[PDB]
Write a protein that binds this ligand. Structure first.
Ligand code: 2CN
Ligand code: MG
Length: 284
């Protein structure tokens, strides 16, 4: 097991540690591709976590700095300020593959920005956030999961990224509340006559259900769009990408079954995951 290999494995560990779904799925990619995926995810994972370190930025800029470095001189050695195991893997990728560097910045910008989180006025702000945090990730991933990236590829991938984020939001309503965050828009809330603090104490009612389902619909629909254009992705990637999607949609029927609880994280059993993989796998 060589030296890069050792990096990609930290990267892998990190991915596997955060999201069990993504890993379940993207691990079934070919060697070349899944290792690049691992690199990217880890970089991003770091970017999100860079805040809970000292209680201040630092890092984040380092990470920005190490990235900006690779962007510039990809074939020179760098002494990375942040995490070296990761920045290495990425550099390796960056050699063999195109990288939407901008999108990393977009994501970093989004994280800088989230320090002064005020609630969203309107769904537009919400949708703008989803872009920042996930639409960006989809773009970065695009050269990895398709043979000839066209505007069209990028668009789908982004749209998938945004959807999943929306679902993860939908799943984490309680948990997010606890850390003084609410992602539903002020607008949508007033319209639906929901106060999240009140639901948290007194359990769900009909208004919450409806506001949640309003958003559940947006996701569901967007996921159907993406499924239709799955073909923009390379042949090996398609069933994998369908998998990750399916697993994530599946999260919604979970929240439903749990009666939209705000006092815990629902999950998709590993066994159900496999069941899905089988259904998809079977049709390929
Ligand atoms: C082809 C389909 C592409 C699928 C894309 C995957 C969706 C997003 O995947 C990600 C992976 C790694 C990291 C991130 C950032 S998470 C994040 C960032 C910023 C802030 Br503020 C809060 C969070 C948070 O989740 O709380 C997202
Ligand atoms: Mg979240």
């Amino acid at each position: 097991m060589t030296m890069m290999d050792m990096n990609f494995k930290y990267c892998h560990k990190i991915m596997k540690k955060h999201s069990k779904s993504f890993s379940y799925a993207f691990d079934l990619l070919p060697e070349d591709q899944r290792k690049a995926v691992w690199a990217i995810y880890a970089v991003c994972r770091k970017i999100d976590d860079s805040i809970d370190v000292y209680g201040d930025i630092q890092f984040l800029n380092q990470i920005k700095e190490d990235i900006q470095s690779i962007e510039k001189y990809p074939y020179e050695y760098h002494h990375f300020q942040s995490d070296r195991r990761i920045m290495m893997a990425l550099q390796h990728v960056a050699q063999h593959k195109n990288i939407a560097f901008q999108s990393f910045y977009n994501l970093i910008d989004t994280v800088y920005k989230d320090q002064h989180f005020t609630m969203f006025e309107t769904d537009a702000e919400l949708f703008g956030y989803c872009y920042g945090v996930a639409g960006t990730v989809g773009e970065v991933l695009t050269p990895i999961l398709s043979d000839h990236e066209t505007h069209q590829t990028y668009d789908v991938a982004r749209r998938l990224g945004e959807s999943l984020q929306l679902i993860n939001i939908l799943r984490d309503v309680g948990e997010d509340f606890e850390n003084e965050r609410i992602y539903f828009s002020k607008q949508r809330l007033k319209q639906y006559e929901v106060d999240i603090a009140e639901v948290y104490q007194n359990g769900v009612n009909n208004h919450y259900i409806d506001l949640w389902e309003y958003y559940a619909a947006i996701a569901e629909k967007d996921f159907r769009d993406v499924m239709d254009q799955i073909k923009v992705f390379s042949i090996e990637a398609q069933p994998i990408i369908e998998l990750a999607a399916r697993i994530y949609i599946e999260i919604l029927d979970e929240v439903r079954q749990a009666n939209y609880t705000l006092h815990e994280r629902v999950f998709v059993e590993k066994r159900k995951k496999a069941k899905l993989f089988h259904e998809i796998n079977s049709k390929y």
